[PDB]
Design an enzyme around this catalytic site. Structure first.
Site, PDB file in Angstrom:
ATOM      1  N   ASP B  97      -1.016  20.272 -26.363  1.00  0.00           N
ATOM      2  CA  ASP B  97      -1.580  18.639 -26.110  1.00  0.00           C
ATOM      3  C   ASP B  97      -0.536  18.166 -25.335  1.00  0.00           C
ATOM      4  O   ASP B  97      -0.728  17.041 -24.653  1.00  0.00           O
ATOM      5  CB  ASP B  97      -1.739  18.163 -27.551  1.00  0.00           C
ATOM      6  N   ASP B 167       5.751  24.438 -32.074  1.00  0.00           N
ATOM      7  CA  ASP B 167       4.945  23.412 -32.306  1.00  0.00           C
ATOM      8  C   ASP B 167       3.322  24.363 -32.238  1.00  0.00           C
ATOM      9  O   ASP B 167       2.725  24.154 -31.447  1.00  0.00           O
ATOM     10  CB  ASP B 167       4.684  22.454 -31.444  1.00  0.00           C
ATOM     11  N   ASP B 170      -1.387  26.108 -37.768  1.00  0.00           N
ATOM     12  CA  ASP B 170      -1.195  26.785 -39.041  1.00  0.00           C
ATOM     13  C   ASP B 170      -1.478  28.123 -38.904  1.00  0.00           C
ATOM     14  O   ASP B 170      -2.204  28.799 -38.067  1.00  0.00           O
ATOM     15  CB  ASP B 170      -2.159  25.987 -40.367  1.00  0.00           C
TER      16      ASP B 170
HETATM   17  C1  LIG Z   1      -2.067  21.865 -30.666  1.00  0.00           C
HETATM   18  S1  LIG Z   1      -0.394  21.998 -31.060  1.00  0.00           S
HETATM   19  C2  LIG Z   1      -0.118  21.277 -32.722  1.00  0.00           C
HETATM   20  C3  LIG Z   1      -0.541  19.830 -32.981  1.00  0.00           C
HETATM   21  C4  LIG Z   1       0.501  18.703 -32.471  1.00  0.00           C
HETATM   22  N1  LIG Z   1       1.056  18.656 -31.167  1.00  0.00           N
HETATM   23  C5  LIG Z   1      -0.552  23.643 -31.685  1.00  0.00           C
HETATM   24  C6  LIG Z   1      -0.618  24.715 -30.552  1.00  0.00           C
HETATM   25  O1  LIG Z   1      -0.105  26.083 -31.022  1.00  0.00           O
HETATM   26  C7  LIG Z   1      -0.943  26.986 -30.215  1.00  0.00           C
HETATM   27  N2  LIG Z   1      -0.810  28.329 -30.580  1.00  0.00           N
HETATM   28  C8  LIG Z   1      -1.441  28.997 -31.557  1.00  0.00           C
HETATM   29  N3  LIG Z   1      -0.801  30.444 -31.541  1.00  0.00           N
HETATM   30  C9  LIG Z   1      -0.057  30.679 -30.710  1.00  0.00           C
HETATM   31  C10 LIG Z   1       0.638  31.548 -30.124  1.00  0.00           C
HETATM   32  N4  LIG Z   1       0.403  32.813 -30.626  1.00  0.00           N
HETATM   33  N5  LIG Z   1       1.307  31.300 -29.009  1.00  0.00           N
HETATM   34  C11 LIG Z   1       1.511  30.303 -28.480  1.00  0.00           C
HETATM   35  N6  LIG Z   1       0.849  29.101 -29.033  1.00  0.00           N
HETATM   36  C12 LIG Z   1      -0.062  29.335 -29.938  1.00  0.00           C
HETATM   37  C13 LIG Z   1      -2.364  26.444 -30.064  1.00  0.00           C
HETATM   38  O2  LIG Z   1      -3.205  26.936 -29.028  1.00  0.00           O
HETATM   39  C14 LIG Z   1      -2.082  24.891 -30.037  1.00  0.00           C
HETATM   40  O3  LIG Z   1      -2.371  24.510 -29.084  1.00  0.00           O
HETATM   41  N1  LIG Z   2      -2.555  15.418 -37.343  1.00  0.00           N
HETATM   42  C1  LIG Z   2      -1.573  16.617 -37.051  1.00  0.00           C
HETATM   43  N2  LIG Z   2      -1.789  17.729 -37.536  1.00  0.00           N
HETATM   44  C2  LIG Z   2      -0.871  18.908 -36.997  1.00  0.00           C
HETATM   45  C3  LIG Z   2      -1.744  20.170 -36.807  1.00  0.00           C
HETATM   46  C4  LIG Z   2      -0.883  21.209 -36.814  1.00  0.00           C
HETATM   47  C5  LIG Z   2       0.325  21.232 -36.319  1.00  0.00           C
HETATM   48  C6  LIG Z   2       1.031  19.971 -36.257  1.00  0.00           C
HETATM   49  C7  LIG Z   2       0.164  18.965 -36.652  1.00  0.00           C
HETATM   50  S1  LIG Z   2       1.076  17.398 -36.894  1.00  0.00           S
HETATM   51  C8  LIG Z   2      -0.095  16.115 -36.399  1.00  0.00           C
END
Ligand SMILES: C[S@@H](CCCN)C[C@H]1O[C@@H](n2cnc3c(N)ncnc32)[C@H](O)[C@@H]1O
Ligand SMILES: NC1=Nc2ccccc2SC1
Ligand SMILES: C[S@@H](CCCN)C[C@H]1O[C@@H](n2cnc3c(N)ncnc32)[C@H](O)[C@@H]1O
Ligand SMILES: NC1=Nc2ccccc2SC1
Lengths: 294, 293
Positions: B97, B167, B170
C-alpha cells in the site's frame, strides 16, 4: 435506544448512533438475561466458547464488561487515581454497579470506606449472579452500595467528604447524560477534600474527541488545578481504547507519575494490566489527541 | 475469506484467526472486489456518516482505512529509523500500500529503499484508491518489486540494509513463512552490524503464544535484543497491534529514541508518533510484560 433487536441471527452487534458506520460483533452461545430495567436495557450472554470473551454484559446496546478483558479499565481507574493520592481513606464511585472498580479500590489498605452509587439496581443484582469475579466486593464491610442517581447524590453530599471520586459511567446517551456535564463536576469539586483526586469514564479519542476536549476545558474552569488524560487498551470498548480524565483539585500534583507506586504495595503482583510503567505510559497521547493534555 | 464478508450492507471481519468475534464497517459503495494472483482483495467506501473513509481488506482482513492508517505506518517507520544512528538503506517486505515507505521517505538520511511485496495488485489498487498512502511508490529513492519476500532475502548479500521493516498480512495466506525462524535467520544476515528490524507483531490479546515463540526464536537466531512496541489501531482485531523491534548490535536500547523525530523537519506533520509515544509503546500490560522483561 437499542434493546433486544441487537441479538439476531446468532450474533450480538453493537450498532449505535454514538458510533455510526461501525459495530463490534460477538457470537452469542446463550442469552442469560435480556430485559428493560427501570432505566436501561440490560443484556447478559455467554459468548462463543471457541473464543476468549466469556460472559458479556451490555447496557442500552453497549458492551460494559466481558470476562476476558474486564480487568483493564477497572485496574486503571482504581490504581491510577489511588496511587496519585497521598492517603486515600474515603472514596466515592459513581456508577460502577458491576463492582469492578470497587474491587480494585479495596485492594488498598489505606481505604477506610468506599461509597458506590449506581442508578440501576438490576446491574448490581445481575453482576452478582453472572460476574462473581467482578462483583466480589459489592458486599464488603468497607463498601456502602446505594441505588440512586449520582447527580443527586453528589448534590446532597457535604463539602470536603472524599479523597477520591471515580466516575465509572455508561456513555452519555442514557441515564448518564448529565454526568458528562458542568453542574455535576462543580459538585464533584466541591465534595472533594482540598487534596482530592477524581477520574472518570473518558470515552474514545477516535470518536469523542470533541466532548473529551469540552470536558477537560470545563473541568479546569470549575476549579480543578490539573486535568490529564490517561489512555488504555480495552478491546470491547468501541475502537479499542478508552481513557480517563484524571483531575487534581490541588495544584502541585503530577498525576502522571505515581505518587505512591503500586510496587511498594502487597497486591502489585496480583494485577493483570496495571503497574507503574503502564501508569506513566498511559499519559502519552497520540499527537492528534494531545490538546486534551497540553 | 473473500466476497462473502460483504453482507447486508456491512463488511464483517469474520475469521478463523479470531473465532467468535468480528469488527464490522458499514459499506456505502464497493469499489473493487476481485481475486489477485495471491489474495482476495476488496476495497470499499464506508458510511459517509462515519469517519473511516475508504477501506481495503486482503483475505477478509482489514489492512488500511483512510481514518486510522497513519498509526501503524508512523510507528513502524519512525520507531525503527529513530532507533538507528544513520539509516541510509532500508528494505520493506510487504508494504505494497506504500504507507510504511511514505514514513521511511520522510527521513533525510535515506538514500535508498527497496520494497518487495508478493502481490502487485495491492500496489495497483493503492495507487488507484489510496493516493495519500501510495504516492511514495513512485519515489526515485525506492525500487518497488513484485515478488515473495523470502526468496528476495535469500538472494540478498550480507550486510545490505540498515533497517528491515516486515509489514505483512497475518500468518494465514502468503505471509505464512515470514513468521518463521528461517526467514529471520536471513533478516539477521542481510542487516549491517548496527541494523534494526521491526515487523507486524500481531495482537497481545489473540496471538500472545505466537509473539512469545517469535520473540524467542528471533533472539536465538542471534539478534541481541527484541522489544515489542504496542500501538492503538481501531481496525486491527481487538484494537491494538504490535511490532517486535530487534537490534542486531548488543547494548542498544530501542525503547528510548536514539535520533528523536522532534529534531527532524517533519515532526509536526505526524498524527500519532512522537518521542513520548515511542517510549510509552514499550510499556506492556503485566499479562504480556515478559515479552520485554
Ligand atoms: C497491505 S500490507 C499491511 C497493511 C498495512 N500497511 C501487507 C502486505 O503483505 C504482503 N505479503 C504477504 N505475503 C508476502 C510475502 N510472502 N512476501 C511479500 N509480501 C507479502 C501482502 O501482499 C500485503 O500487501
Ligand atoms: N488496520 C490495519 N490492519 C493491519 C492488517 C495487517 C497488517 C497490519 C495492519 S495495521 C492496519
Ligand atoms: C456498568 S458501569 C461501566 C462498565 C465498566 N465497569 C456503568 C454504570 O453507570 C451507571 N449509571 C448510568 N447513569 C448513572 C447515573 N445517572 N447515576 C449513577 N449511575 C449511573 C449504569 O447504571 C452502569 O451500571
Ligand atoms: N468493555 C468496556 N466497555 C465500557 C463501557 C462503558 C464504560 C466503560 C467501559 S470499559 C469496559
Amino acid at each position: 435506544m437499542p434493546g433486544s433487536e441487537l441479538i439476531s441471527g446468532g450474533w450480538f452487534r453493537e450498532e449505535n448512533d454514538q458510533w455510526p458506520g461501525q459495530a463490534m460483533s460477538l457470537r452469542v452461545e446463550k442469552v442469560l438475561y435480556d430485559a428493560p430495567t427501570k432505566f436501561q436495557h440490560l443484556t447478559i450472554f455467554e459468548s462463543d466458547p471457541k473464543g476468549p470473551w466469556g460472559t458479556v454484559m451490555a447496557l442500552d446496546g453497549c458492551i460494559q464488561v466481558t470476562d476476558y478483558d474486564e480487568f483493564v479499565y477497572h485496574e486503571v481507574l482504581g490504581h491510577t487515581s489511588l496511587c496519585s493520592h497521598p492517603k486515600p481513606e474515603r472514596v466515592l464511585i459513581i456508577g460502577g454497579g458491576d463492582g469492578g472498580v470497587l474491587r480494585e479500590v479495596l485492594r488498598h489498605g489505606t481505604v477506610e470506606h468506599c461509597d458506590l452509587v449506581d442508578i440501576d439496581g438490576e446491574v448490581m443484582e445481575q453482576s452478582k449472579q453472572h460476574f462473581p469475579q467482578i462483583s466480589r466486593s459489592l458486599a464488603d464491610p468497607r463498601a456502602t452500595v446505594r441505588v440512586g442517581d449520582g447527580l443527586a447524590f453528589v448534590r446532597q453530599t457535604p463539602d470536603n467528604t472524599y479523597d477520591v471520586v471515580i466516575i465509572d459511567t455508561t456513555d452519555p446517551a442514557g441515564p448518564a447524560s448529565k454526568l458528562f456535564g458542568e453542574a455535576f463536576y462543580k459538585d464533584v469539586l466541591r465534595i472533594l477534600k482540598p487534596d482530592g483526586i477524581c477520574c472518570n469514564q473518558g470515552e474514545s479519542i477516535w470518536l469523542d474527541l470533541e466532548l473529551i476536549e469540552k470536558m477537560s476545558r470545563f473541568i479546569r474552569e470549575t476549579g480543578f488545578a490539573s486535568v490529564q488524560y490517561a489512555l488504555m487498551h480495552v478491546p470491547t470498548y468501541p475502537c479499542g481504547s478508552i481513557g480517563t480524565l484524571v483531575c487534581s483539585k490541588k495544584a502541585g500534583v503530577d498525576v502522571t507519575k505515581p505518587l505512591r507506586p503500586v510496587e511498594d504495595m502487597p497486591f502489585a503482583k496480583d494485577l493483570k494490566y496495571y503497574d507503574s510503567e503502564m501508569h506513566k505510559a498511559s499519559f502519552a497521547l497520540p499527537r492528534f489527541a494531545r490538546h486534551i493534555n497540553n
